[PDB]
Amino acid sequence: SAKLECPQDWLSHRDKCFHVSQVSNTWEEGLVDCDGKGATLMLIQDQEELRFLLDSIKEKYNSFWIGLRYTLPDMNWKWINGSTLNSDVLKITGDTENDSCAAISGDKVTFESCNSDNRWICQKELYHETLSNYVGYGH
């Protein structure tokens, strides 16, 4: 769609706005930082998303956490919203079996122990009221 309004620091792209925080935190901690604004830790759908990231990244020679968590036991990458990773866009090894959480580092995506001091990317999705689903359960 045409995107709704988001705070000025947040780079606006197809219905989502990004804050490329050049300050470091741990993965879960950066996630909480996104929670703090009423936003989410970056949820990537397609490579169009990341290509705009590469524009907004600016530095590249850093690493910025996105909402990619490696869920074990399962061995798939899931997002914080509960979606499945599109590993086909860039280098994100699915079968790694490590304590990994992923971060943008340059034109690549890298992954390491979620506890590493790294910067992060918050996205505030302009469409967060898209599908809430359920009326609870059905009582």
In DSSP notation, 4-69 reads ----TTSEEETTEEEEEEEEEE-HHHHHHHHHHHT-EE----SHHHHHHHHHHH---SS-EEEEEE
CB 41 within 8 A of CB 65: yes
Half-sphere exposure (CA, 13 Å, Cβ side) for 25? 19
CA distance 56 to 23: 15
The secondary structure element, H or E, covering residue 70 is strand 64-71
Bridge partners, 111 (sequence order): 102
The domains of the chain are located at 1-139
Decide: helix, strand or coil at residue 76.
strand
Cβ atoms within 10 Å, residue 132: 7
Q: Which fold has domain 1-139?
A: Mannose-Binding Protein A; Chain A (3.10.100)
CA 116 to each of CA 33, 48, 79, 94, 107: distance values in angstroms, whole numbers, following the listed order: 16, 27, 18, 20, 20
Contacts of 134 (CB under 8 A, 6+ apart): none
CA 76 to each of CA 22, 31, 41, 96, 98: distance values in angstroms, whole numbers, following the listed order: 28, 19, 18, 9, 11
